[PDB]
Amino acid sequence: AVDCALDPLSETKCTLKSFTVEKGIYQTSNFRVQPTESIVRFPNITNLCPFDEVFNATRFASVYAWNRKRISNCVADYSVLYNLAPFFTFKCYGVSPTKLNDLCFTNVYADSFVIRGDEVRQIAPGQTGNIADYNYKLPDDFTGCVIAWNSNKLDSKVSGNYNYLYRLFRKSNLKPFERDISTEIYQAGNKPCNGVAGFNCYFPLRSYSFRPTYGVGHQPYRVVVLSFELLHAPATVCGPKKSTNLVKNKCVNFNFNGLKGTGVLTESNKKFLPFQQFGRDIADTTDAVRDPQTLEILDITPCSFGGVSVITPGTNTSNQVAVLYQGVNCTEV
Amino acid sequence: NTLVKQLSSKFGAISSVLNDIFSRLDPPEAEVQIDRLITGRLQSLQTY
């Protein structure tokens, strides 16, 4: 047996896959410097932002007039979005619905409405049907989450509810995130309908008429869609992570506002100007960052690394080796 | 220079960097993106 981490001769044997090494110079591996500490930097915003009244609301809007709300400059918490109901559907595209407590987003959009029971599958990327092309359309590069839950005990009534409407007739399919509130009559025929009902003149709205008696696949469902935008920005909104003091001139691993890395942070001389947040290099990688608690610029440089070679005669003659470190001045090994 | 510039390709994945892929998706799903990136980079280096 041979231990591949005892001495350079053993490493050479382990690389060559042999118990005898002949005369020559062999390239064994590379040497790096490991991190010692760990820091996390997040913005100092501590207030919360509206999530209770988005879900604990009295009346949601119809499908064709879906309610839109913008969420920014807060601290998001998603633990409270667990006990909505005994059973509910929670599907996230582009993110996993367990890791969105340590991610920083630019702007959050919340769209709320109420849908027929069996049409929940139609709120999805690139799906066709009745509401996905005439009421609510989603893009093909969506990055967000969809939540749906039962609303029989609250919405359906015995006396009769007719306050929820959808649209059935339209010229062309809707652009994503586009709303229509027109009531102009349909023109299937060749003659004008002069704003009166008749054949080929249909009013492009319809009612649900929910009653507590229909089958399990027909009761109303409440649907809310969350849209994110994970890009480069001041990062107005993100969740509950505790900050830590920053260190300099030491190889550590860092998490700057959602950007994870390892390296050495140094005071910067770049000529940033107000709107510039971070910088790049020739190879399209991050080089400079701006600390979101002091508004100062730091430069990132990976800590020392290099290549190691072993010079030995044949194992038949001796077991002595010499080590060559490539491209380094060994006053700074 | 072109070998260096190939590092910004996506190869059908959701991002051109690895840390955000590992910090946004669960282990069951990040494997496809990691495989795509690894295969693309291996092909580029082999061609070189």
């Binding site: 020739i282 190879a283 | 070998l3 260096v4």
Partner: peptide
């Protein structure tokens, strides 16, 4: 020599960026 000097003069940050990706150049 004179001609050798002329020939040597005739033929002539990116290196650091390449090195930080793992590509190095060995000496003769």
């Amino acid at each position: 020599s004179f001609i050798e000097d002329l020939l040597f003069n005739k033929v002539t940050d990116l290196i650091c960026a390449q090195k930080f990706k793992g590509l190095t150049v060995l000496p003769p």
